[PDB]
Structure of mRNA-capping enzyme nsP1:
Amino acid sequence: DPVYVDIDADSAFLKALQRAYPMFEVEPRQVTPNDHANARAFSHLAIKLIEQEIDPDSTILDIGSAPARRMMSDRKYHCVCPMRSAEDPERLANYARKLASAAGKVLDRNISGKIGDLQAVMAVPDTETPTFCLHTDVSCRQRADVAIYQDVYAVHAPTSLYHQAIKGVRLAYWVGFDTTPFMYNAMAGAYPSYSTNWADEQVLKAKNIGLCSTDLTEGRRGKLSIMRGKKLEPCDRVLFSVGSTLYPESRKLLKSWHLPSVFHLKGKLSFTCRCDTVVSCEGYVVKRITMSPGLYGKTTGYAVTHHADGFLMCKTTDTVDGERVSFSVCTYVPATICDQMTGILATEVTPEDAQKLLVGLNQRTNTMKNYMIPVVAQAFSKWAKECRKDMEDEKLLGVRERTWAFKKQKTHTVYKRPDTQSIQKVQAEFDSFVWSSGLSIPLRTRIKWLLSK
Amino acid sequence: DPVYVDIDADSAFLKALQRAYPMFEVEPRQVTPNDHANARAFSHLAIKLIEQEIDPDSTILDIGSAPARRMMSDRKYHCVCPMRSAEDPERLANYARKLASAAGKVLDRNISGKIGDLQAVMAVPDTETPTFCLHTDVSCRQRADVAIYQDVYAVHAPTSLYHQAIKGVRLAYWVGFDTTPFMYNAMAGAYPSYSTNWADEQVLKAKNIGLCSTDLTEGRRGKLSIMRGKKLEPCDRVLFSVGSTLYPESRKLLKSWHLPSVFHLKGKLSFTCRCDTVVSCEGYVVKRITMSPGLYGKTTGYAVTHHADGFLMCKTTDTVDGERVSFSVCTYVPATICDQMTGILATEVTPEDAQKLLVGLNQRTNTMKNYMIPVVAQAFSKWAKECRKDMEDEKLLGVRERTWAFKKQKTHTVYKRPDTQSIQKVQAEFDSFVWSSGLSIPLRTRIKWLLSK
Amino acid sequence: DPVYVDIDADSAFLKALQRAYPMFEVEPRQVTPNDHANARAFSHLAIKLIEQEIDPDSTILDIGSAPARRMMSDRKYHCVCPMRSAEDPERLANYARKLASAAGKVLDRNISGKIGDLQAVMAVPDTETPTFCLHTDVSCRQRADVAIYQDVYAVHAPTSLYHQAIKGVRLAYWVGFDTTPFMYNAMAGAYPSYSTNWADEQVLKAKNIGLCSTDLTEGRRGKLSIMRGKKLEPCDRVLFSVGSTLYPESRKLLKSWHLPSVFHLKGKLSFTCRCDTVVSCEGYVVKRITMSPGLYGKTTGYAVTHHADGFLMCKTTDTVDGERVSFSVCTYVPATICDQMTGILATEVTPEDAQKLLVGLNQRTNTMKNYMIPVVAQAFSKWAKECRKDMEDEKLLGVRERTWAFKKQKTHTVYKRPDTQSIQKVQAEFDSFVWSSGLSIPLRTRIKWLLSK
Ligand SMILES: Nc1ncnc2c1ncn2[C@@H]1O[C@H](CSCC[C@H](N)C(=O)O)[C@@H](O)[C@H]1O
Ligand SMILES: Nc1ncnc2c1ncn2[C@@H]1O[C@H](CSCC[C@H](N)C(=O)O)[C@@H](O)[C@H]1O
Ligand SMILES: Nc1ncnc2c1ncn2[C@@H]1O[C@H](CSCC[C@H](N)C(=O)O)[C@@H](O)[C@H]1O
Ligand SMILES: [Zn+2]
Ligand SMILES: [Zn+2]
Ligand SMILES: [Zn+2]
């Protein structure tokens, strides 16, 4: 009845975990010095909660599975494992090892059936079995009614969901990092509670952001290159660092999971679908999606995010490979600090004074990580200034002057305070939806040898 | 005898709930991290109180019902469910699932009768049964004497009430958000105790209101567009955000439920009707309506609101898509803070000093939400100024000078203090009152399969 | 079940050791005054943890072994010992002595088998035995599935790993000093928690770095030499001092162990490999490597380091053999000190004031070693200055001016704060991979005499 997580007993993250999962009873039990422990604990609790929601006798598709995680579960999983990633052969070997080690000692689980299914798949690679197969999300043929996506960032969401729906699935879950900073189109950012940093490929040679590296120079003035760059804009390629584990990602596929509250899937068959956010903790979320046959209602095309902690986006100046430039950066701020800055921001404050005030509030133990304090101090200072400029240039009610052109004002900070909401316009009507094994003989031989014993 | 609500045991909202429902005994029992928990708790208690008022042996029409909420009740409900919303098929499937799960375990409730009625409706979609039907409020033919509207914003109130009255209904209840801010014709606003924000569609690209989103710019002066806008006025389309759930609404239909204390319905038959407010809690209300055959008395056409907390409407300046404009905003303020500002407002005070005083009063735990403090500080500052201008320009008693024209003074704030009343002029004489299933074969097949087992 | 380490009972390093190995229970038991005790304790615990991971019945290759360390172990080691180092004959004699001393007193270990294997190898020097051989990593022919490298810096990593893989090894471990400072290309540096200093061969006659020596002079101005040096750049030869033990090293071979997260080995057979960091303590690390047959996925060529303590690289001025020059130096800083300097660095601070503040923070017992304090104080002072220069020269968003050349700014400090990550670009596709005993008759005779008794 208790749930055990692998974190230190004196961690501050434990209270946030307890507030996010009020239906459980959370115990710390540390066994390793993992440098991304908080992220793993959140994923573990999310799987527990999802299993508690649904009822047994239903079969669950596990898209992009890691089979060894599902091996001591009593529910009915069908693991979809294509070998498209360099980490997959080791996961498969680990599954076979775990299976062979406990073959008679454990009896409640369908251990023998799992061994037989794996052997049958190794013999002929194009066969479906109740617990395993080697197809993709589009080419699997097992029928079910629940689908799960755990830390899956590599598929286009509407195509995948349509292919699950034409097979009888009515309910789906998605677990992962919040997609909001990519809808605002930032160049780099942080998830500080999870020791995670990310950056665009064009700024990996910066100096003072979370994920970067550069070197010492004396500063020659020449650097004469005829190739005129002249624009610094975000591109599709992004790099993620979770603790010390590296993952590359694509901006398009990340944006495709920022789904509106109502949408329609219109193909040979038609469906009406909804998406809600049911767990949200300092930048990690769980989403629940339902799908129904036929067309009902109408769509607006709006997606909403609720901010429990503060969210910040701002302009910063740095050197990239020695050349001075400006670009945008985003982060999260705890609610108590935001509440304690309300009085200060009524006036104009310099960045240095803001930094001293924030250090005073923080270190009274650390509420927030120190390496983000200088950028936050700068953002708060610009926001406070811009507000004053609005108060000194009043307009007339009900009137929009355009004498025959109007000017845009400059904006250097966006600041979403606790208990406010973001709203963005996205696509809501989808009509367009458009095989070889990939295994190799030596790996098959290794698995067969490791199993047949 | 206790009533259990899904909120945290240390919440401040519990005392307000206890004061609003003095006839019950309210216990906190938290099971989920719902981000709009307070609104759900208020609706739950409202249904309990309404059921305690009326007597059994009467049949209750449930307009726009969600049937699974009425399934474990001992009273006699007739649920009117047309499938006009994208959320409806999932509600129907959930009802059928709940019914099938507990088919012999629960015996007191008319479980078997409900199953039979649902099956009979699925067979032929144009039949009335004692517990269910697929018609609208105008085309249902079941006769009753009580009607209930729970969070229903999609109908025109006098037409709907007339169609209920010609069928023998004598008493009706309405539960929902207070309609007063839409009678004052504001452009955006907040219900802060319920984590709720709303906005006109024309200002969704603002920067510093509750529900909005914008981006960074350097401020080009060109933006040369020949299309002269030249007026910024409210329009019919509005967006509501309750926690993170989104709802679109129409201004006309919202205004139609702000009913006067006495009115007449004059058709083929005639009725005389009254409307009173019986519960009011920080912007959420319950209204009771009675109807009688024949015409009696006379009407004035006035509607009254009593303010227990302070109500504010004021002019603010912002940037929308980068262009600087002014428009009106409304909110609610707790009574103790209003009482503690009485001495300060005797003189002229700057907005910055007002903001510092409000922060001092608030954080001594938080009485009011911090993200509204800057706008409130501005409003109080303008009100205090305008009062002084009245005191320095006295007129003569009993005289209205119009030398041959008179000027209007500028007004930037309206402030209704605790224990005052608003009064507005509305229509009170109504004479004008003016079908296919909408279900689909695959959904019917799914429901039949899910039921027949 | 306790693990015993040879350190003083009042040492501060014990808490760091306990945090790095949370699965053990660490007891101090001092028996010698070793001046590099901390390094030996870390290596001991690393071997314990690795043995706990893997399962028995597997045979372990020990590359560049010291056999006497493996003599009282119950696992199955095959020690690869070529006599290429001046320390090797004494290690071999010590092994034979240890074996002969306990020949009947100890029975659980394969003592008799080990004696027989050593004698058989002495008779014919080109024979493999289950526990011993005299080949190199490339010319050994024993088959196994685990390989271990303990403090091995003399081989080129991809060639060695390929030769282990074509023999059936699937898992490998590497224990040693962190390779990050050599990827930044520094000229000298320190690992202060382990009493270790290192330097390039060209600066051994400096005055104020960790490892150096010089003499007194009155300063003649002549020193007329026609040989124009004119550049001071790092070269391949480096010297390491661990306590008072000296080791020479090569920069190329050290860099070759800074491996990316995914890579491919493409020869006659092909493999896909991964490298993760599983233990990290103040500059000492353990790396785990897996290899699989066949080609899967794709590579990026990036390597990542996670910083738990602060890392610093900076420019310094010294005299070398009496001539004044400048070059770069690197070190590590504890996290609490870094956190306590956050407020000070918002302004410009002189080096002297920084030094006084650091002395105040440190001596309140010593958190960090005093001989590094002057260089750290200088680095912090320059970093704080450079940040200000960025804040006073803002650019426009999204724009990279190159009017037709751009200038590089000067950078004198790189500072990686706690909870940030370094990222470097390295090679990830490897295709190119290209014997006499070396023992002598008198040594063989000595070993035979010492054994035959
Ligand atoms: N089109 C596709 N259909 C199904 N799986 C896919 C896919 N494309 C990539 N994948 C798989 O998705 C996985 C993402 S990483 C695996 C995450 C895993 N669910 C976990 O819990 O750790 C990869 O193994 C990759 O092989
Ligand atoms: N003209 C009409 N007559 C009856 N119901 C209507 C209607 N127009 C819309 N509705 C229904 O009113 C519902 C409003 S949302 C449902 C609210 C529900 N009573 C609850 O407690 O949660 C929708 O399901 C919609 O189908
Ligand atoms: N090509 C090679 N293959 C295997 N061992 C080698 C080698 N080149 C050098 N060595 C050996 O590697 C050793 C490094 S010093 C020995 C370290 C030892 N593992 C310990 O725990 O203390 C030397 O003894 C040297 O003989
Ligand atoms: Zn399948
Ligand atoms: Zn009906
Ligand atoms: Zn050998």
